[PDB]
Design a protein around this ligand. Sequence first.
Ligand code: MYS
Ligand code: MYS
Ligand code: MYS
Ligand code: CA
Ligand code: CA
Ligand code: NA
Ligand code: NA
Ligand code: NA
Length: 300
Amino acid sequence: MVILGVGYFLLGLILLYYGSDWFVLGSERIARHFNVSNFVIGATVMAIGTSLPEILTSAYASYMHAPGISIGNAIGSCICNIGLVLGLSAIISPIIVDKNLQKNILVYLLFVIFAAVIGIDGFSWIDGVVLLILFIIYLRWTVKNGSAEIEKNNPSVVFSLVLLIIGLIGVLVGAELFVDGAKKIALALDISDKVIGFTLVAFGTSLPELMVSLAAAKRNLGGMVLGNVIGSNIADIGGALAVGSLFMHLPAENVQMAVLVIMSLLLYLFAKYSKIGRWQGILFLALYIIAIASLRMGGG
Ligand SMILES: CCCCCCCCCCCCCCC
Ligand SMILES: CCCCCCCCCCCCCCC
Ligand SMILES: CCCCCCCCCCCCCCC
Ligand SMILES: [Ca+2]
Ligand SMILES: [Ca+2]
Ligand code: NA
Ligand code: NA
Ligand code: NA
């Protein structure tokens, strides 16, 4: 039963590795097909695709009367996407943000500040509906401003969509196998710890973002990286958190929200007045490390 766990674990890593690169390549081609920037494709198709685990997890957790896990997973993913995912990626491929993308990031920041303020007393189903509506508006606004609309079944298109979809299946299945594999290893060795397992929920669901962002960074696709991070956070709030709140009132996470707000503000300030490169990435990593060293365990 331990060899099966090791099997899943290694296999999940393989799928994650190759799948992420396929997803990126297919997404980069699709962007060129539709005449939209890499940021746009990153913030929409990629962000949502990779946030499907958060959405499902938050929904499932709140339905099972564990709303703390529901919001813990959602906001923890956001902190992970900036501190760990963007941190690593910025070091690998530093980014200077153009003026139009700076505007997108400011909208993101406002969205996050708005979510923090209405969530001070926790999140109701009404808070959820509002956030989901802003999420949809964000998506349409983003696509419009990053689109140059001008124009059977071209082999370039097909191969693009195949890469993208198979890549996405690869990263999502791979993330699942990684986690399921780890869990059966821990169970087999009798080192299973539930509160540890619930602490790592936002991470396991963030493995697609991590591997996808790293693959894009290796190909110097900085805008795509930034799109994936910014979009995943909005999807995690207007999607994962929001849907959670539909089943049950979510408890406040004011400390984690303050952390997210601070990291999000830092991200905008770097984008606007500087760059997102080596030392910005180092700072994001240091803050992430401080966060996981100090924040209360249990995943909510
Ligand atoms: C943004 C212009 C200044 C760049 C240098 C200051 C921002 C990066 C600071 C990194 C500090 C890293 C500390 C690690 C412990
Ligand atoms: C090309 C590699 C450049 C340096 C990468 C440094 C990463 C530092 C991450 C944080 C270390 C711990 C800080 C603890 C407060
Ligand atoms: C370099 C400016 C940092 C401003 C915020 C400083 C305190 C740390 C905030 C982020 C990480 C989580 C801290 C609480 C665990
Ligand atoms: Ca074409
Ligand atoms: Ca509220
Ligand atoms: Na995502
Ligand atoms: Na995710
Ligand atoms: Na996550």
